[PDB]
Amino acid sequence: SDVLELTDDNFESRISDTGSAGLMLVEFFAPWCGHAKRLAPEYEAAATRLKGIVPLAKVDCTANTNTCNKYGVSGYPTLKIFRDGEEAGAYDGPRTADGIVSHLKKQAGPASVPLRTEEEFKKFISDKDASIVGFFDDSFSEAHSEFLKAASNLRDNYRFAHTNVESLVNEYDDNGEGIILFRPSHLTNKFEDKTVAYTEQKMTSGKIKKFIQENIFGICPHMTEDNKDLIQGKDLLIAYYDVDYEKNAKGSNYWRNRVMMVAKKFLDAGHKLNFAVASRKTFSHELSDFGLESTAGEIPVVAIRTAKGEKFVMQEEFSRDGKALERFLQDYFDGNLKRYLKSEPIPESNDGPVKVVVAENFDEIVNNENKDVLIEFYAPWCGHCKNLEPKYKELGEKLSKDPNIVIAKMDATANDVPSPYEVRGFPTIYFSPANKKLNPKKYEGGRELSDFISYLQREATNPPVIQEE
Amino acid sequence: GPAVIECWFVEKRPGALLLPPPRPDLDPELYLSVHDPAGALQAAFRRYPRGAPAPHCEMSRFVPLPASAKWASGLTPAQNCPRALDGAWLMVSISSPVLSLSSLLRPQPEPQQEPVLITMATVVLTVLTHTPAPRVRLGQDALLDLSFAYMPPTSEPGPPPFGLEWRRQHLGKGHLLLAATPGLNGQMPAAQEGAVAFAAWDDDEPWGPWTGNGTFWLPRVQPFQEGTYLATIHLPYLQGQVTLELAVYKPPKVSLMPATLARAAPGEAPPELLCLVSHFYPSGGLEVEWELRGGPGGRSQKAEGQRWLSALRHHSDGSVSLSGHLQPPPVTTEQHGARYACRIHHPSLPASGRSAEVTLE
């Protein structure tokens, strides 16, 4: 195949004869590794599809302990990029042929792609990602220089290009030097321009970077595995559904347009919040943090994650009207929504001897400033928890007459455990004093009915009334 | 207990485990000198009943790999294989009526050795059960014993998170009864049939090796829970499995009707006797014998008269009942004081059976 096989023998030597960019991708692996076996096909495809551009090599660590030890390989597969013979960072990409070929092609420079013809230009901005294109008619411009500084600094997250082609330079600027940002055409929409022009008087790398960050996405980008790390982190509303612009472009726009429809109103009105649509499938693993069911239903589901970490989930179904989404946003901005918590239903009757706590009533029960609360966090499968159940139930009965002490329990696997508390193993028992709600103490004592009585008598806020017979 | 264990390597080839006697008859890449840091494998056979048959042993090539079930994925967050697991592995399966054990060994690359030609191997994970053929009384709780031991790579906190899974299997159809990954809060499959488990590390010492518990607690066992149980312990990329064969049983309560007989004149026939054989399991193997004790012919003679059996009666708990009947012949005066009795035999009963009697007048 086109994959070079390096060894402790020829590594240092063969690792330097690189193609044009002095770049080489090296896969450190072991043939027994499952992930390594899975990548094999992809890596072979990538290698041949990069022939001439960037060479790909693989090192069998089981047979070459010295070279793997030298580059600190501790897991397989480990993909490292080498430049002119020295380590140059790990390959932070999907383990697919397409992922590898594209990343390395960009990596194989230039930071900014020169456009020599309108044909090359039209083709550059016909990509699925945005395009940052610089237009300069003067070869010695300081602006063109500042642009290249930006390209280098940001080439990791954006696609850069520049041109001096008479036509292009004329059409996109007056003064012979400007920067145009082109949003993917398949996301073109009646709610915002498809291109944004740089308008700062002076052109500096720093100002360019800020200009990029602030405009590439528009009011509602399509979040993909490729750009998620650029979109998440800030106050963000994500509408999840069947987003796929290859086989379902119509449906994709259909919903995205209704989302942006509402977004624009609140946005123009001054409210602050970022928006984005994303594949219910590509991010199915995130849907659980909002307690959202990924049904092939096709109808979108909405949920906000504040920069802090707060999670707000639209409960009402998505109306093709946008009114539902508009309502959810109104409440959100008016502070009317309750953050999302995984929780079992509040029990119909919760009358001792052991108070049943779930995430929804946790605050109400455990954090009632006027009470001492001993709470047991257990798991349905735990045997030691089953043995404590009866003994704990008795404790509750013996404390039934005390109006200051509450004996409670919560299934910690079926309910989010609030911040203060940390559930190590099972069972974890905490004691929350009447006026130390922020500082509950973890019960380290024995689990016999007598140990609990002894503990309470020694820690209760007010003298405890323990029924005795 | 045993010093060596004859074993079969499959993919058979003869092999052996030495818990050094030369063995030209073996490979010796299949002749293993066992180093067991955690100690569970060696401790299991140190207790082995003397004179007990040789346990069955199977050896095979093992390849570390993430657990397939998604609930266990938490044990393997990073998407890459640990280098510490390079090198070959052998999985050892040992079973007998005393115990059922599974072990993951790491043999040295080459056999060679100064004293004798044998291959050094190290025990990494041991999963063991001292109740391989449990017999629980119907309606009672069953405690399927399970212990394990893990030796971490000395190539580099306390004991790591691990996974435990219990299932009842029948005809390639397995039902997950319990699953857990103590030390790693995750979404576990629902525990079934009220089962729970004492799944935990015996201690949390700094570097290890460590031993742990995973015994299964199945409440009020019924006949439908009878069968093959598989228990698996999970460690990143490593798993050990043992098999238990659970049998349910219930001895029968035996009683007669009438409970006592009135006085009767010779040539007169006593009332039909009913021998109730109540709530027993399994249904088969129940035998009814009628006897005449303390009579003009030894205190044990087979009774005469007409006898028959009722059909089986099936209860909700899966146990069964049945009735034996005997119509004794007209009573003789030389039978006065003798007793009619029904001797019940059932595999869940002693050799002498269980009886019930009534005295004649």
Ligand SMILES: *[C@@H]1O[C@H](CO)[C@@H](O)[C@H](O)[C@H]1NC(C)=O
């Ligand atoms: C396992 O745990 C149970 C319950 O704590 C205990 O009774 C049993 O003896 C333990 N067995 C082992 C393997 O130590």
